Amino acid sequence: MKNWKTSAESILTTGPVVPVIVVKKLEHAVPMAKALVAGGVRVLEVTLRTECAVDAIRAIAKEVPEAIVGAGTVLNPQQLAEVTEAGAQFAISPGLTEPLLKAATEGTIPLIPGISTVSELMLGMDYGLKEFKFFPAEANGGVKALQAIAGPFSQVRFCPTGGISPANYRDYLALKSVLCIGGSWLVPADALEAGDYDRITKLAREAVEGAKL
Amino acid sequence: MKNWKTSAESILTTGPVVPVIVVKKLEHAVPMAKALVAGGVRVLEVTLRTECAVDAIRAIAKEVPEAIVGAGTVLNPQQLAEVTEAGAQFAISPGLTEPLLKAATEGTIPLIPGISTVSELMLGMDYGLKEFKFFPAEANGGVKALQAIAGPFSQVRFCPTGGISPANYRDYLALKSVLCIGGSWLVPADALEAGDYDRITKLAREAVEGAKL
Amino acid sequence: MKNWKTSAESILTTGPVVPVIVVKKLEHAVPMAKALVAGGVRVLEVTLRTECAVDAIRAIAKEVPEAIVGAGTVLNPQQLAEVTEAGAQFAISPGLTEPLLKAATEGTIPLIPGISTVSELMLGMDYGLKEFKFFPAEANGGVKALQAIAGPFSQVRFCPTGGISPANYRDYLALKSVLCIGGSWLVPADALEAGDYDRITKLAREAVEGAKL
């Protein structure tokens, strides 16, 4: 993608786990980010699901240069522009649309959009995309659905998200078409409150080590 | 929606159950409508699946003005225009398309379209819709699928239809994102054959009572 | 379809099984095709998943006149034009897109595109299509998903492909909405590589026989 200095591919190959973060209290954002990085996890997807999401991205971009912070739940060009202005290095959407694909490919940061069907995948491919999220992974029919969906497209790569846990992420990572998975367990909503970051570091370290072979 | 004097939201918040109606003999339409209204069920989806469907909508709008009569299985702008002219107060589609979303938003009655994936949901959201049918519910993976799909979208509301019955409607109604469900069991064929409209009134009454809490 | 001398329907009604072919070695294409025809299987889908695919289609169209050869994995107008020029009698795609639907209906050969949802089906129906692939059949939820999806569309017909084998093709063929199925087992990759043509003829004959009643 000519307008993207950082490729979507590089974002996904950084590590085997991309945490799907929901941040309710802004003050927890930076420490949380540092804790994840200290555990070996650098690509951070801050979902636009709370009022302070954009401000958390901005704060993490400024105070934690060691993170590759991005946005999640980007639903339209308007939000895409807002997270870009805030410093997102990448954007994730749970699905795709023509206006979002047009705005993203014309913009400066990579978009890795979710798909659930081959038709949706083909529409992203019409805009030159090769990297996608497979969301909701389990609900779309998990590993087997993903193996079927990917069968006719040898060059495509995914980051399945949705119902993935330490119990099954290895099943996904074993696939040739999968580069990494998205998960919510590295940052327990209740771990935030009270200032419990060592817990988060530990979980991240275990996620990374549990991913090998 | 600026062109819609009756909102899509008000159609779905009217009651917990929207009967999905397949009218084979025109003469049954009006008495069936009155019987459903007597039992407290007023939002009536007359599917464009039988030859007399548009005539039933027109007869119900004329003889049972208190019912909120609408059309179902609306597949394109041409059908939407026909049911609108016939007196439909709302239109339901099993899936969505851009010309259908465009024609609907340019028109006078609300469209509540079905979606099965987040991408389809996002395309509806680009036209500013917030109310959707989740069809076919069970085959799309039922409750869990809907819970995964709805997780990143806090403002959207659904009316799941497809495989819902007394056995499981409460499961769907309990979700925060669900306002009502679509079902076919309120109008049994044998009650019509018997002219036992009281059976239909009773079933509607039970559907509504069984939905509380 | 006015620009299609051969209807999409005639393609699907020719036989109960359409082999999904992956030809790695160009030299094996013609005798493979003759072996399938000798076993009673004429509609051949040569997928655009190998470098020699378009040449295989050309060689089969010229040399095995009793075969109805077409292309598979057609992803955009460019590929459609190319297989059209090489002699394909039909095109199959794993999903659909407006550009693909528009180029196909303006063209000379039938496109039977795959769908997974009612919205995808409706988009195809906006361009006048009545015949579709249901891909990936099993991952989409198999027979039940297909039954639910087709319930509101009495005129639509399908060719399910994806996870279908002798163990279950009968379950699909028994549906009133199914005209035939697509499968990969008649042409085992290892038989094509070695030139086991009597084996291929035998598998084809068993496929056809096992499909009755």
Curated annotation (Swiss-Prot), chains A, B, C:
GO MF entries: (4S)-4-hydroxy-2-oxoglutarate aldolase activity; (R,S)-4-hydroxy-2-oxoglutarate aldolase activity; 2-dehydro-3-deoxy-phosphogluconate aldolase activity; aldehyde-lyase activity; identical protein binding; oxaloacetate decarboxylase activity; oxo-acid-lyase activity
Subcellular location(s): the record lists:
Cytoplasm
**EC number assigned by the record:** 4.1.3.42, 4.1.2.14, 4.1.1.112
The entry sums up its family as follows: Belongs to the KHG/KDPG aldolase family.
Query: Catalysed reaction per UniProt?
Result: 2-dehydro-3-deoxy-6-phospho-D-gluconate = D-glyceraldehyde 3-phosphate + pyruvate; (4S)-4-hydroxy-2-oxoglutarate = glyoxylate + pyruvate; oxaloacetate + H(+) = pyruvate + CO2
Per the annotation, which location comes first and is thus the protein's main one? cytoplasm
| Description of the deletion phenotype | Cells lacking this gene show no detectable KHG aldolase activity.
Q: How does it assemble?
A: Homotrimer.
Active site per database record: 45, 133
Q: What is the effect of changing residue 168 to S?
A: Shows activity significantly greater than wild-type
Outcome when changing residue 184 to A: 1.35-fold decrease in catalytic efficiency with KDPG as substrate. Has only a modest effect on the catalytic efficiency with KDG or KHO as substrate
Q: Which gene encodes it?
A: eda
CDD domains from the UniProt entry: KDPG_aldolase
Q: Record's GO cellular component, any one?
A: cytosol
Question: Where on this chain does pyruvate bind?
Answer: 49, 73, 133
Q: In which pathway does it act?
A: Carbohydrate acid metabolism; 2-dehydro-3-deoxy-D-gluconate degradation; D-glyceraldehyde 3-phosphate and pyruvate from 2-dehydro-3-deoxy-D-gluconate: step 2/2; Carbohydrate metabolism; glyoxylate and dicarboxylate metabolism
The protein in question is named: KHG/KDPG aldolase
GO BP annotation list: Entner-Doudoroff pathway through 6-phosphogluconate
UniProt keyword annotation of Cytoplasm present: yes
Q: Which NCBIfam families does the record cross-reference, listed alphabetically? A: eda (TIGR01182), PRK05718.1 (NF004325)
